[PDB]
């Protein structure tokens, strides 16, 4: 339970980094 919750929490944060890098890498292409 400890180690799966940590993976849920890592995936939560890693998801939002990766979400926003893609979204803002879009508008660098659009100026």
């Amino acid at each position: 339970q400890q180690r799966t919750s940590s993976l849920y929490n890592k995936t939560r944060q890693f998801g939002i980094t990766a979400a926003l890098i893609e979204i803002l890498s879009a508008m660098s292409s659009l100026e």
Partner: protein
């Protein structure tokens, strides 16, 4: 003296709360407050704080109130410096907003002085060389997780466990044992929760209308835009800094909630066009908390001792907003619901709690053992 005092400018661009201002005789400094003089179609005034400079004549700002009805080329005038907030014993008993205007309808404040919101944190020489115990007069705290002078203190606990009761008791007990006043930064708080604090303090007589008051309230609530909710933590801290530095006194500060400071800055940082760091927070997350939390410390002149609420989003303690805050904190107070429901008040679970000054060097050997 005060240069750039009434220097006139015009509104160049308005995109949400973020507003650009063109000045003919050069732009003011950074963090400079600007009153929008134009128009009487608004019901409340508009005050802009400069965050960035674009060119020598243009400067980008953030609105403390809503930016409704704001036309282009509208007349804007400087204040003289940063956003100025009233200080001293005339503030005690009164409620305030981010700017320092009284929001309680009890006449004009007695203010003999005003101080700027964006003060610099104390230097190395100003810091105390005696880590000293702040006796709260409470058994669980003083014995097991003693709060120190200058300390950042953290109040962990779910809904309806005894948070507002403990803050009120600390406002009483600071004033009993050290004679100190208190300040409450309602940072991004519910407006309806602000009424219940004001009434319960009036019933218990920590705030008194007819007589002596020992509390200050500075509220920047959820209804307000991000510019206010961001800066309102510093407004309260300026008032506590006056009681620390000038009056030379032990003072309490109460920030509910310090996450809402970081979250408020996360909104403006997005609108300013800055690229977000980890988990969509502002890239200056550690720096924002740095300049705020470092001002809260025990100087040679006095001691501010801030108890803070910290929201852990999604119960994820690894999140940047709490994780960055944990380094700054001295005494972690954890309140448990099962302890409250069993009959023990205050509901402090002593095993999950901890304090930095729980050490044979700081406190006495008999205290530690």
């Amino acid at each position: 003296v005060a240069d750039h005092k009434g220097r006139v400018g015009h509104v160049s661009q308005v995109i949400g709360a973020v507003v650009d201002v063109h000045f003919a005789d050069g732009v003011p400094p950074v963090l400079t407050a600007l009153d929008v003089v134009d128009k009487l179609g608004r019901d409340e005034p508009l005050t802009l704080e400069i965050v960035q400079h674009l060119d020598a004549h243009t400067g980008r700002c953030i609105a403390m109130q809503t930016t409704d009805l704001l036309k282009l080329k509208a007349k804007v005038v400087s204040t003289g410096g940063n956003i100025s907030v009233p200080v001293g014993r005339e503030t005690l008993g009164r409620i305030f907003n981010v700017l320092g205007d009284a929001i309680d309808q009890r006449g004009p404040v007695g203010e003999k002085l005003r101080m700027p919101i964006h003060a610099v944190a104390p230097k190395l020489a100003d810091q105390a060389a005696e880590d000293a115990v702040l006796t709260t007069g409470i058994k669980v705290i003083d014995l097991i997780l003693p709060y120190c002078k200058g300390g950042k203190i953290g109040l962990f606990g779910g809904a309806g466990v005894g948070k507002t009761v403990i803050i009120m008791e600390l406002i009483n007990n600071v004033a009993k044992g050290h004679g100190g006043f208190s300040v409450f930064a309602g940072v991004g708080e519910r407006t309806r929760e602000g009424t219940d604090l004001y009434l319960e303090m009036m019933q218990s007589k920590v705030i008194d209308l007819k007589g002596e008051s020992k509390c200050v309230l500075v509220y920047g609530q959820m209804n307000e835009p991000p510019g206010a909710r961001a800066r309102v933590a510093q407004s309260a801290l300026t008032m506590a800094e006056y009681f620390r530095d000038v009056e030379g006194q032990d003072v309490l500060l109460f920030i509910d909630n310090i996450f809402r400071f970081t979250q408020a800055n996360s909104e403006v940082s997005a609108l300013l066009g800055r690229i977000p760091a980890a988990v969509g927070y502002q890239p200056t997350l550690a720096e924002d908390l740095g300049q705020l939390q470092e001002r809260i410390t025990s100087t040679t002149k006095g001691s501010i001792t801030s108890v803070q609420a910290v929201y852990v989003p999604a119960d994820d303690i690894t999140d940047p907003a709490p994780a960055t805050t944990f380094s700054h904190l001295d005494a972690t107070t954890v309140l448990d619901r099962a302890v409250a429901e069993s009959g023990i008040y205050p509901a402090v679970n002593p095993l999950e709690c901890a304090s930095r000054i729980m050490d044979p060097d700081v406190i006495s050997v008999d205290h530690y053992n």
